[PDB]
Write a protein that binds this ligand. Structure first.
Ligand SMILES: C=C1[C@H](O)CC(=C/C=C2\CCC[C@]3(C)[C@@H]([C@H](C)/C=C/[C@@H](O)[C@]45C[C@H]6C[C@H](C[C@H](C6)C4)C5)CC[C@@H]23)C[C@H]1O
Lengths: 11, 240
């Protein structure tokens, strides 16, 4: 669903 | 029979927890100030508190053995569905039966039923939530069992949207077995009695708390004047 911030914290 | 590997897992999750739970709650001061005058007077503060907590839960999850092996999308799926549950779980640490509030040091950062009410929730959630905390607290988990239950909660195969369920299940099993074994070797009676099954029952309680939480959040967030007051991450994770 496009989660830039969640995606970015997972990195 | 607590293997070298299982002991390693425990050590990892304990350190992971220590790195993501600051028991001095010093950071709470960055949060928007709490207001206990009061139409959703506590929403902006608790918004920041929860948003903060989501960050820390993400950080904890990333250090769960195997969690990194999942796809980008599955990690996302597991975090969005579990986040509120793991916040409820990890909050047990600050919760005191001495008065059934979450006590994060100062009275400003001590949160009770009405504060949760003044953040927009009804007893439909608050009552069973407090019941959860009470029963989880009574279990008096070793911190080892506490961090394993959080990890087990996160890597659940049946979460909606999961692609590689088999992989997710394989990661959780290693954690379950580690937990079951830890209890048998490390938790003395009477405390160990039925302890694993009681812990798993708490996971079921959490699914129910999660279901009710989603409905009430869907109602709180539905109004832009509410949603306007949240944080970008809460909106991204809980629902926008
Ligand atoms: C480091 C810690 C400390 O233990 C402190 C801690 C404390 C945790 C606490 C004590 C207060 C109330 C909490 C947040 C519970 C409540 C039912 C959830 C509400 C959200 O739906 C929401 C969403 C959104 C709108 C509204 C206000 C904000 C932002 C919140 C409603 C769950 C866990 C409870 C968490 C933990 O991470």
């Amino acid at each position: 669903k496009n989660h830039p911030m969640l995606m970015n914290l997972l990195k | 029979k607590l293997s070298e590997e299982q002991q390693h897992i425990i050590a990892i999750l304990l350190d992971a927890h220590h790195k993501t739970y600051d028991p001095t709650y010093a950071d709470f001061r960055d949060f928007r100030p709490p207001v206990r005058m009061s139409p959703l007077s506590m929403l902006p503060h608790l918004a920041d508190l929860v948003s903060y907590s989501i960050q820390k839960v993400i950080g904890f999850a990333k250090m769960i053995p195997g969690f990194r092996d999942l796809t980008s999308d599955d990690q996302i799926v597991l975090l969005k569905s579990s986040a509120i549950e793991v916040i409820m779980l990890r909050s047990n640490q600050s919760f005191t039966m001495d008065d059934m509030s979450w006590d994060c040091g100062s009275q400003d950062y001590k949160y009770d039923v009405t504060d949760v009410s003044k953040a927009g929730h009804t007893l439909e959630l608050i009552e069973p939530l407090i019941k959860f905390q009470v029963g989880l607290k009574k279990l008096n988990l070793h911190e080892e069992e506490h961090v394993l239950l959080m990890a087990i909660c996160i890597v659940s195969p049946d979460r909606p949207g999961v692609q590689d369920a088999k992989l997710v299940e394989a990661i959780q099993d290693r954690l379950s077995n580690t937990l079951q074994t830890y209890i048998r070797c490390r938790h003395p009676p009477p405390g160990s009695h039925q302890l694993y099954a009681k812990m798993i029952q708490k996971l079921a309680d959490l699914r129910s708390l999660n279901e009710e939480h989603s409905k009430q959040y869907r109602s709180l967030s539905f109004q832009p004047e509410n949603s306007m007051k949240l944080t970008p991450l809460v909106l991204e994770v809980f629902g926008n």
